[PDB]
C-alpha cells in the first residue's frame, strides 16, 4: 500500500510540476513585455525633460549674460542659505575672521 | 488552473504596464512645464532686480551679504576659537 | 519505494529547472531593452542640451556647478575649519 | 556603448562635466558621509565680505 500511494504522489507530483514550470514561462515573458513598455515610456520622458531641460538653459544663459557676476554673487547665496538651512552641521570660525570686523570695540 | 490563473495574470498585467507608461510621461511632461515656468520666473525676478543693484552696487551688495550671513550663522552652530 | 521516490524527486525538480532558465533568459532580454532604450534617451537629451552650452559656456558651466554645489552640500554634513 | 560614444565625441570635455557634477550629485545623495571644507574653499569665495 505504501508502495502504491508514492507512485501515485509521483505521478501527482510530476503532473503540478508541469503545470508549474509553464505558469512560470508565462509570467516571465510577461514580465518581459511590461518592462520592455515601460523603458520605452521612460525613454520618451527623458527625451521631454531634456527638451524643457535645454529651453530653461537658453533663457537662463542669455538673461544672466546680461550680468555674469552679479548672478555668480546672488546664487552663491542662495545656494549657502539652502545647504546650511540644516541644523546638522558644525562651523568654526575666528573673531579676525572680516565678517566679525565689527566684533572689537572701535 | 495554473496555467489558466497565469494566462489571467498576464491579461491583466499588460494594461496596467500600459497605464503607468502613459501616466510617467505625463509626469515627464508636467516636470518640462514647470521647469520652463519656474524657469520664467527666476529670468523675470533677476532682470528685475538688476537695474536696482547697478544704481548703488554697494550698498545692496553688502545688505544681501549682510542678510545672507545672518541666515546662514543662525542655521548652525558656531565654534569662534582663535587660530 | 525508495527508487520511486528518487525518481519522483528527478522529475519533480527539472521543470522548475527548465522555468528558472526561462525567467533569467527573459530577464536577460529585458535588461538589453531597457538599457538601450536608456542609452537613446541620454543620448537624446546630452544632443539637445549641448548648442545652448556651446551658446553661453560660462554662464552654463556656473550655473550648473552652483545647482550640484548646492544639493551635494545639502545632503551631505559640513565641518568649516581654516587649515 | 556605441550609441554613447557616437553621441559624445562631439564634445568630451562638457560630457565630463555633466556627467562628474551627476555622479556627485547619485554619490553623496545619502546622509551618511562628512565633509571638511574651507572658508577658503573657492565654493565659499563669496562668503568673505566685498
Known sequence: ?106 | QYIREAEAYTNEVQPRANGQAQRILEEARAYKAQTILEAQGEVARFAKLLPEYKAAPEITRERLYIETMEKVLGNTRKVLVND
Open chain 1, 1 to 106: 500500500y505504501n508502495r502504491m500511494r508514492a507512485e501515485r504522489e509521483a505521478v501527482a507530483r510530476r503532473h503540478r510540476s508541469q503545470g508549474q514550470e509553464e505558469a512560470e514561462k508565462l509570467r516571465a515573458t510577461a514580465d518581459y513585455e511590461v518592462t520592455r513598455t515601460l523603458a520605452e515610456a521612460e525613454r520618451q520622458g527623458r527625451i521631454m525633460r531634456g527638451e524643457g531641460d535645454a529651453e530653461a538653459a537658453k533663457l537662463f544663459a542669455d538673461a544672466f549674460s546680461k550680468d555674469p557676476d552679479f548672478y555668480a554673487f546672488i546664487r552663491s547665496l542662495r545656494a549657502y542659505e539652502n545647504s546650511f538651512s540644516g541644523n546638522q552641521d558644525v562651523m568654526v570660525m575666528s573673531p579676525d575672521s572680516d565678517f566679525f570686523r565689527y566684533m572689537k570695540t572701535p
